[PDB]
Amino acid sequence: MVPDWEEVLGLWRAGRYYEVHEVLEPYWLKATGEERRLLQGVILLAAALHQRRLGRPGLRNLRKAEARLEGLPCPLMGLDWRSLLQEARRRLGA
């Protein structure tokens, strides 16, 4: 199975970071290789953004996300993850 990025992107844009996590976690757990790195990276960005919203440190989740996404082809699994990373950096002030 693969995620419905249109559904995920709809949650992401709305800022529903917990829900993005809920949808992707099952896929991440069963994923392998680059697909697993992609899924975990998106999950980590959502986590960093959720933490920033709470006024807490999120740069640690961001660096981890960057290491997971670093070097991946784009798009991947039909997702333009670079745009998500770029947006996350702007919102996190990084």
Side-chain angles (χ1 to χ4, degrees):
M1 295 78 92
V2 302
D4 183 319
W5 293 119
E6 290 301 297
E7 179 196 359
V8 180
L9 285 177
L11 295 175
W12 173 277
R13 291 198 292 276
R16 305 197 189 85
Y17 299 131
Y18 179 66
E19 291 174 62
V20 167
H21 179 273
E22 288 299 70
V23 172
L24 300 182
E25 195 176 65
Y27 293 103
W28 163 69
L29 288 165
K30 304 302 180 64
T32 190
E34 294 190 311
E35 285 179 50
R36 189 183 184 84
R37 289 172 56 192
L38 171 66
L39 287 167
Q40 179 73 303
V42 173
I43 287 174
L44 289 162
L45 293 176
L49 288 166
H50 175 67
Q51 287 305 299
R52 168 65 73 276
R53 172 184 301 173
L54 298 167
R56 299 187 61 177
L59 292 162
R60 177 175 169 289
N61 275 160
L62 178 59
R63 265 48 185 174
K64 210 171 178 179
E66 287 181 302
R68 291 291 183 296
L69 301 169
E70 188 71 299
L72 290 182
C74 187
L76 202 184
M77 290 192 85
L79 173 70
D80 168 18
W81 58 268
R82 277 216 180 69
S83 289
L84 264 34
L85 176 59
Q86 298 168 337
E87 171 191 347
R89 281 166 177 163
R90 292 196 297 279
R91 290 177 182 285
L92 296 171

